Ligand binder design. Sequence first.
Ligand SMILES: OC[C@H]1O[C@@H](O[C@H]2[C@H](O)[C@@H](O)[C@H](O)O[C@@H]2CO)[C@H](O)[C@@H](O)[C@H]1O
Ligand code: NA
Ligand code: NI
Length: 149
Amino acid sequence: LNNLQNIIYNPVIPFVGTIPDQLDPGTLIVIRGHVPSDADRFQVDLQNGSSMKPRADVAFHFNPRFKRAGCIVCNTLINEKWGREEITYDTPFKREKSFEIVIMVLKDKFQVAVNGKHTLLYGHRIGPEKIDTLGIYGKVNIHSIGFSF
Ligand SMILES: OC[C@H]1O[C@@H](O[C@H]2[C@H](O)[C@@H](O)[C@H](O)O[C@@H]2CO)[C@H](O)[C@@H](O)[C@H]1O
Ligand code: NA
Ligand code: NI
């Protein structure tokens, strides 16, 4: 890390907020918090705007789910239609456990690590320059949101 500057502490979920700079290659988004014991799922959405009707495009939907053995669904929403799901079954998330999510923006893809260990990759389907909004929804508690540009 270093260069990480945390804004937003303990936001009310759902949280929707504008990202303070363009997500150029090398940028980090760092989200710390924990999963409550009654959690079915939560999501971190990198969005093109904050429109609700029509629902803003989600360039990167990062969606841990905890039913059964749990997983992480990643996907992209365009014109309120979901695309092809990229499912990661080796999920490090567990109910009643803390996490640090680090999303690293590369030229061709996102690289995501959780609690210091690599978790997944997701190739860009929308140009990252169109991402200006971070949403966090569902059953999750967030201590901090920060960025490293
Ligand atoms: O793709 C993310 C999107 O998934 C929706 O649910 C899917 C589900 O993940 C898939 O495995 C199942 O087979 O069909 C559903 C069809 O939409 C969620 O409703 C949505 O919240 C997004 O998370
Ligand atoms: Na959704
Ligand atoms: Ni805590």
